[PDB]
Amino acid sequence: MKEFYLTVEQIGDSIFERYIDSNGRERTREVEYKPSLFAHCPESQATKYFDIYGKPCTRKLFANMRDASQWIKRMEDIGLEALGMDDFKLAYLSDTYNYEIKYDHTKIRVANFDIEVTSPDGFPEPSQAKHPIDAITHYDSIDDRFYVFDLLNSPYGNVEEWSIEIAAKLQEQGGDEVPSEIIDKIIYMPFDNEKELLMEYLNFWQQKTPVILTGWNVESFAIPYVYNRIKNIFGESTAKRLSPHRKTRVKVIENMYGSREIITLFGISVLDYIDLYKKFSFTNQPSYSLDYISEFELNVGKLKYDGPISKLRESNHQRYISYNIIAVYRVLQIDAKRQFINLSLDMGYYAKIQIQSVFSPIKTWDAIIFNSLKEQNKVIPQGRSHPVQPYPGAFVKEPIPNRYKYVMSFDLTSLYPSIIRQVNISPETIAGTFKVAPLHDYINAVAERPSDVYSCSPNGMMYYKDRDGVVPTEITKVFNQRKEHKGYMLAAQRNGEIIKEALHNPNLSVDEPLDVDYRFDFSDEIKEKIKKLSAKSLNEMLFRAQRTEVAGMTAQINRKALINGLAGALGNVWFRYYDLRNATAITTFGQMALQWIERKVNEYLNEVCGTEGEAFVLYGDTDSIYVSADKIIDKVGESKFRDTNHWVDFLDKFARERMEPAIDRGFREMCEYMNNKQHLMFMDREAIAGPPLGSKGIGGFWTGKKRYALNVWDMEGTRYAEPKLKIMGLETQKSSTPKAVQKALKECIRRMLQEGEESLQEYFKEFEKEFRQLNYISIASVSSANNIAKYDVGGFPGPKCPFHIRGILTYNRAIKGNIDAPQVVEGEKVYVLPLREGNPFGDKCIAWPSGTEITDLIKDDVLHWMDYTVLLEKTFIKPLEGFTSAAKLDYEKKASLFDMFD
DNA sequence: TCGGTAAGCAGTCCGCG
DNA sequence: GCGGACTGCTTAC
Numbered sequence: 058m059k060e061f062y063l064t065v066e067q068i069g070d071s072i073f074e075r076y077i078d079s080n081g082r083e084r085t086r087e088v089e090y091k092p093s094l095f096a097h098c099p100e101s102q103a104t105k106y107f108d109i110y111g112k113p114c115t116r117k118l119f120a121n122m123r124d125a126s127q128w129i130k131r132m133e134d135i136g137l138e139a140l141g142m143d144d145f146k147l148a149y150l151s152d153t154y155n156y157e158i159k160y161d162h163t164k165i166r167v168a169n170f171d172i173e174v175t176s177p178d179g180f181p182e183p184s185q186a187k188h189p190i191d192a193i194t195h196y197d198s199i200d201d202r203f204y205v206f207d208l209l210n211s212p213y214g215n216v217e218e219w220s221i222e223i224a225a226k227l228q229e230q231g232g233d234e235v236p237s238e239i240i241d242k243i244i245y246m247p248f249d250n251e252k253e254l255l256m257e258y259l260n261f262w263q264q265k266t267p268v269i270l271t272g273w274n275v276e277s278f279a280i281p282y283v284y285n286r287i288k289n290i291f292g293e294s295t296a297k298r299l300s301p302h303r304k305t306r307v308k309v310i311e312n313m314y315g316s317r318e319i320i321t322l323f324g325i326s327v328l329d330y331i332d333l334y335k336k337f338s339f340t341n342q343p344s345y346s347l348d349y350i351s352e353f354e355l356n357v358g359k360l361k362y363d364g365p366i367s368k369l370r371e372s373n374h375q376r377y378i379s380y381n382i383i384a385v386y387r388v389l390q391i392d393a394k395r396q397f398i399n400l401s402l403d404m405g406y407y408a409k410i411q412i413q414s415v416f417s418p419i420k421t422w423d424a425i426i427f428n429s430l431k432e433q434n435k436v437i438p439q440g441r442s443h444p445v446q447p448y449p450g451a452f453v454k455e456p457i458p459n460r461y462k463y464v465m466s467f468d469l470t471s472l473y474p475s476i477i478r479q480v481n482i483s484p485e486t487i488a489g490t491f492k493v494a495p496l497h498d499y500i501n502a503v504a505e506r507p508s509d510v511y512s513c514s515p516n517g518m519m520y521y522k523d524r525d526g527v528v529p530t531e532i533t534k535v536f537n538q539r540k541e542h543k544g545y546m547l548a549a550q551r552n553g554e555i556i557k558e559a560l561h562n563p564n565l566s567v568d569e570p571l572d573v574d575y576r577f578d579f580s581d582e583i584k585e586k587i588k589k590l591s592a593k594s595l596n597e598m599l600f601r602a603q604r605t606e607v608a609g610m611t612a613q614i615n616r617k618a619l620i621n622g623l624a625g626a627l628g629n630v631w632f633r634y635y636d637l638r639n640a641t642a643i644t645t646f647g648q649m650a651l652q653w654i655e656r657k658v659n660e661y662l663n664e665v666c667g668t669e670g671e672a673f674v675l676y677g678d679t680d681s682i683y684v685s686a687d688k689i690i691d692k693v694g695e696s697k698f699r700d701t702n703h704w705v706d707f708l709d710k711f712a713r714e715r716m717e718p719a720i721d722r723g724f725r726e727m728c729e730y731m732n733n734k735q736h737l738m739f740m741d742r743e744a745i746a747g748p749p750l751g752s753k754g755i756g757g758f759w760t761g762k763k764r765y766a767l768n769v770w771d772m773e774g775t776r777y778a779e780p781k782l783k784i785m786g787l788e789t790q791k792s793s794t795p796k797a798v799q800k801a802l803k804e805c806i807r808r809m810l811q812e813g814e815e816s817l818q819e820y821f822k823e824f825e826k827e828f829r830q831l832n833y834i835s836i837a838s839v840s841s842a843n844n845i846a847k848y849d850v851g852g853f854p855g856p857k858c859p860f861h862i863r864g865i866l867t868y869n870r871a872i873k874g875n876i877d878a879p880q881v882v883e884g885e886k887v888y889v890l891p892l893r894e895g896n897p898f899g900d901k902c903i904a905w906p907s908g909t910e911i912t913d914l915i916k917d918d919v920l921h922w923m924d925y926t927v928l929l930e931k932t933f934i935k936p937l938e939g940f941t942s943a944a945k946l947d948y949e950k951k952a953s954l955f956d957m958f959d
Numbered sequence: 960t961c962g963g964t965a966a967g968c969a970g971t972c973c974g975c976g
Numbered sequence: 977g978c979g980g981a982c983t984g985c986t987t988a989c
């Protein structure tokens with residue numbers, strides 16, 4: 058097989074590399090890598106190395122990496138560009154793996170671990186590590202085993218061994234319900250003392266050294282706690298055995314508010330699953346507890362135990378260990394679904410970077426572009442310092458707040474990357490500038506043609522047309538990968554809808570789910586067999602289809618994120634290829650493109666309708682337009698349609714056969730106008746929205762920019778079994794809105810769009826009457842909590858104190874003295890409730906850690922003093938009043954001549 | 960939050976005769 | 977009471 062790296066490090070003048078050799082074995086080597094860097098040289102000197110602008114360079118070979126680094130410094134001292142890859146491990150990887158890397162994941166040791174630490178005096182701080190580590194569960198991907206290290210004797214109590222028999226049993230048998238599929242994979246090791254446990258853990262680690270190290274909050278808790286505890290008991294050298302090269306750094310993580318400390322383990326790639334989840338999931342969650350996220354992702358119940366976690370080991374050690382094991386497994390289950398580790402490996406090996414660098418799109422793209430240029434013997438420029446400067450972004454149309462009955466939306470495929478490719482925007486393709494007219498003049502095609510030679514953006518920039526820039530070349534490659542995975546995602550989605558349809562008529566039989574590839578549209582043969590399947594098999598197929606859709610979503614959305622990040626990186630001062638001329642060339646072209654096509658679509662539809670100056674495009678944001686289709690429907694007449702699906706078909710056909718050709722024509726003209734390299738503005742129909750045929754549903758409404766709701770029957774060619782609400786920006790979509798309120802507001806919107814005003818009034822009346830019964834957590838607001846200390850003046854709110862911070866301060870005063878009280882962690886999320894006047898907390902609100910029940914000693918008082926009226930008006934009524942006034946509807950029945958008469 | 964801009968709403972402070 | 981000048985937070989792209 059072809060070799061591939063696992064990890065790479067620079068330690069002084071040595072590269073330390075762990076890799077898989079040509080026989081599939083894991084090896085480690087120390088390499089005295091001699092780096093090269095570059096200086097400009099005279100043209101009269103013969104060379105094969107050129108910078109990106111075509112200027113000749115001489116290669117400088119250094120005796121070692123420190124010499125190379127010193128040379129960079131002296132070149133700065135002289136005032137001359139020091140060209141080349143200054144991150145020497147990236148150059149090493151480029152030299153050592155000069156081909157597209159094919160990796161074998163089965164050879165990569167992925168370790169998932171979690172530790173437990175009993176602490177009677179609050180949160181066990183990783184920097185202090187003053188409490189014994191009393192449990193470690195460490196799952197190894199190569200052995201496919203859970204290695205359980207269990208401390209039986211502690212200063213906080215001596216316990217009996219954990220029982221695998223009880224662990225397996227149902228919670229109704231007094232057991233812990235450790236999943237049957239992992240029971241046989243547990244290797245249980247009890248220890249009579251902590252020193253023995255840790256020494257054995259280190260010997261184990263030495264034997265089975267993680268390449269990828271993950272788990273939940275491992276980077277901020279488990280890793281620094283283990284490191285520091287071993288350091289405290291044994292000394293630093295023993296703690297450094299967590300690094301295969303025995304090198305670590307206590308590294309400070311800084312942002313804006315403060316700083317925290319993590320431990321860098323050289324020769325390990327830490328991908329904390331919480332960080333993977335935050336980067337790759339495209340969710341914003343009210344809580345990031347593993348319980349909370351496992352419930353969201355897997356629909357598994359919260360791990361139930363009695364009393365505080367600080368007493369769980371002594372009171373129920375059996376459950377303590379079982380929950381430690383289950384916790385490790387939950388992360389594995391989340392990964393089986395989301396496939397973020399797979400994603401990270403894919404992107405890391407593609408870029409030829411340390412796997413953990415996938416968190417940095419700037420590092421990722423720097424390596425991609427470097428490797429690409431190096432193939433042509435081209436030489437990358439030195440990174441430079443730039444002051445942070447603001448620059449313009451997208452255009453967003455101001456909508457008229459209103460109901461909108463029939464709506465067809467259209468959206469440009471991968472806009473910013475497509476602009477880059479179309480215009481040929483790259484550091485080395487800049488050809489010059491032209492004299493800019495107001496943007497409006499380009500939109501309306503009255504400005505002079507920018508260039509007859511170069512490819513242009515309406516920000517004034519011109520680009521070469523003779524050859525693709527490196528940025529267009531490399532962005533195209535990832536765009537193509539993205540396109541493939543999106544295809545699989547959409548097929549799985551369409552396939553899921555077939556199954557949902559079939560589930561209306563389940564067959565009464567015992568059978569099996571079909572063995573199919575959900576990434577490809579079901580054949581007629583499959584469709585016929587599905588129509589004969591039982592509900593049990595159908596539901597299993599649906600679950601599998603949706604799992605396939607999730608896998609495709611992960612693969613596509615994050616490749617989209619990477620390519621959009623390249624467009625964004627051009628406007629980040631830390632990017633080697635930072636250039637506001639290029640960043641703005643992209644955003645300004647986008648502004649023109651949207652407004653250009655708004656004009657074209659309005660012109661086309663006014664033509665087919667035989668009107669003048671009518672506004673068909675009601676809205677647009679960045680790269681999308683929303684077209685009113687009322688007149689199109691009305692041209693055939695509602696009564697002519699058999700059912701909802703009939704007008705949906707008609708609009709779909711109209712969009713594809715009439716509107717899309719007109720859209721393409723408009724964009725080809727714009728391409729010629731800007732003299733672009735290649736027409737890539739592809740705007741396809743996205744949504745077809747409207748009320749159910751013959752109903753009083755309003756179909757949709759806008760309240761303002763980035764705030765709307767649509768009843769969608771077809772999205773990107775997925776025809777839904779049941780209509781789906783597309784809601785953007787409204788409170789139902791915000792993590793800050795209480796859970797039960799999101800749900801209620803969603804149902805109000807559903808009723809408005811599908812059923813009408815009367816249905817809405819019926820539901821409002823009911824919610825208003827019953828809501829005080831809702832669980833306090835479900836009606837709590839949520840907020841991130843930054844700068845708590847900043848607004849704290851002797852335990853009370855300082856000037857300008859935010860509402861949620863006030864709640865935290867109220868909480869802090871209420872828990873002064875309570876030993877079992879959780880602390881609010883700076884920068885994390887909190888639940889927030891309003892409090893009625895004259896409450897014993899002495900303020901108008903209280904806040905506590907999100908994803909948790911409020912501590913028992915104040916819970917009863919909070920419940921008693923919760924201000925339901927304020928809660929209702931602020932989270933439910935105010936937003937609903939916003940929705941209904943926009944839609945010209947009333948959520949309460951107004952008086953009529955029938956009232957109180959006949 | 961260690962890792963692009965536009966723009967919405969909550970809330971504080973305080974004017975607005 | 978609402979709206980502007982702010983801070984804070986969160987979402988649409």
Ligand SMILES: Nc1nc2c(ncn2[C@H]2C[C@H](O)[C@@H](COP(=O)(O)OP(=O)(O)OP(=O)(O)O)O2)c(=O)[nH]1
Binds near residue numbers: 468469470473618622
């Ligand atoms: N830097 C950055 N830009 C974004 C992000 N989301 C959207 N944009 C910008 C770049 C996109 O091309 C443009 C339009 O956003 P869309 O959500 O429609 O995505 P896009 O057109 O790229 O892909 P698509 O084919 O429609 O799924 O807005 C983002 O998360 N980060």
Ligand SMILES: [Ca+2]
Binds near residue numbers: 172173381384
């Ligand atoms: Ca735990």
Ligand SMILES: [Ca+2]
Binds near residue numbers: 470471472
């Ligand atoms: Ca788009």
Ligand SMILES: [Ca+2]
Binds near residue numbers: 587588590
């Ligand atoms: Ca059937």
Ligand SMILES: [Ca+2]
Binds near residue numbers: 469678680681
């Ligand atoms: Ca869009």
Ligand SMILES: [Ca+2]
Binds near residue numbers: 717739740741
């Ligand atoms: Ca098309």
